[PDB]
Design a protein around this motif. Structure first.
Motif, mmCIF file in Angstrom:
data_model
loop_
_atom_site.group_PDB
_atom_site.id
_atom_site.type_symbol
_atom_site.label_atom_id
_atom_site.label_comp_id
_atom_site.label_asym_id
_atom_site.label_seq_id
_atom_site.Cartn_x
_atom_site.Cartn_y
_atom_site.Cartn_z
ATOM 1 N N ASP A 13 0.841 -1.220 0.000
ATOM 2 C CA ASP A 13 0.000 0.000 0.000
ATOM 3 C C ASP A 13 0.855 1.239 0.000
ATOM 4 O O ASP A 13 0.523 2.241 -0.639
ATOM 5 N N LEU A 14 1.988 1.143 0.670
ATOM 6 C CA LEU A 14 2.934 2.227 0.764
ATOM 7 C C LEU A 14 3.477 2.484 -0.632
ATOM 8 O O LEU A 14 3.627 3.625 -1.051
ATOM 9 N N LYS A 48 0.572 4.228 -2.733
ATOM 10 C CA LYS A 48 0.426 5.646 -2.478
ATOM 11 C C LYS A 48 1.707 6.402 -2.770
ATOM 12 O O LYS A 48 1.675 7.572 -3.082
ATOM 13 N N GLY A 49 2.831 5.709 -2.683
ATOM 14 C CA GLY A 49 4.097 6.300 -3.025
ATOM 15 C C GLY A 49 4.157 6.583 -4.503
ATOM 16 O O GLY A 49 4.600 7.643 -4.920
ATOM 17 N N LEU A 50 3.667 5.631 -5.289
ATOM 18 C CA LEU A 50 3.591 5.740 -6.717
ATOM 19 C C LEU A 50 2.651 6.871 -7.097
ATOM 20 O O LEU A 50 3.023 7.769 -7.850
ATOM 21 N N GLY A 101 -0.638 -6.638 -4.429
ATOM 22 C CA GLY A 101 -0.749 -5.576 -3.461
ATOM 23 C C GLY A 101 -0.302 -4.240 -4.008
ATOM 24 O O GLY A 101 -0.611 -3.202 -3.438
ATOM 25 N N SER A 102 0.415 -4.268 -5.099
ATOM 26 C CA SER A 102 0.931 -3.089 -5.719
ATOM 27 C C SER A 102 -0.052 -2.599 -6.779
ATOM 28 O O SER A 102 -1.064 -3.234 -7.020
ATOM 29 N N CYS A 103 0.232 -1.506 -7.397
ATOM 30 C CA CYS A 103 -0.643 -0.970 -8.411
ATOM 31 C C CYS A 103 0.158 -0.621 -9.641
ATOM 32 O O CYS A 103 1.304 -0.167 -9.534
#
Length: 136
Positions: A5-6, A9-11, A117-119
């Motif tokens: 998630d980090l 939102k980091g992306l 979990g990533s995007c």
């Protein structure tokens, strides 16, 4: 910790950061093109699939320069299901047109949240110089 998630939102933040980055540099769109290089999605421009390079070409030609004059808001992401998707839309600043309707460019970036979990950038659509029927 840099969890999934980090990283999401980091992306998103890095992307939005570069979009809202210094006017001192040539184009926020440049940094965006440079961001989307390893994150090359299906760039649908006016309904035609373009890759990073084609986007880059329209960018250098001045097409996507409207992207940082665009309006963005909080898009819906409340219903978290399983394998999410976000579609952030920007509407380039609507410019006073002829027929009591307004000309704007729309940009919809569709991201999916990978089950990992990533995007990642699923596809992003740019529809330059659109309008909508005005209600009379």
């Amino acid at each position: 910790d840099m969890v999934t998630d980090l990283d999401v939102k980091g992306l998103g933040y890095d992307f939005i950061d570069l979009v809202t980055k210094s006017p001192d540099s040539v184009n926020s769109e440049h940094e965006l093109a440079h961001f989307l290089g390893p994150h090359d999605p299906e760039i649908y421009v006016n309904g035609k699939i373009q890759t990073t390079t084609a986007f880059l070409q329209f960018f250098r030609q001045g097409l996507f320069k409207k992207l940082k004059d665009a309006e963005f808001a909080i898009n819906v992401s409340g219903k978290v299901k399983e394998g999410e998707g976000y579609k952030l839309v920007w509407k380039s600043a609507a410019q006073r047109s002829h027929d009591q309707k307004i000309r704007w460019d729309e940009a919809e970036a569709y991201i999916w949240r990978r089950k990992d979990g990533s995007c990642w950038l699923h596809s992003v659509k740019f529809i330059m110089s659109k309008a909508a029927p005005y209600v009379a």
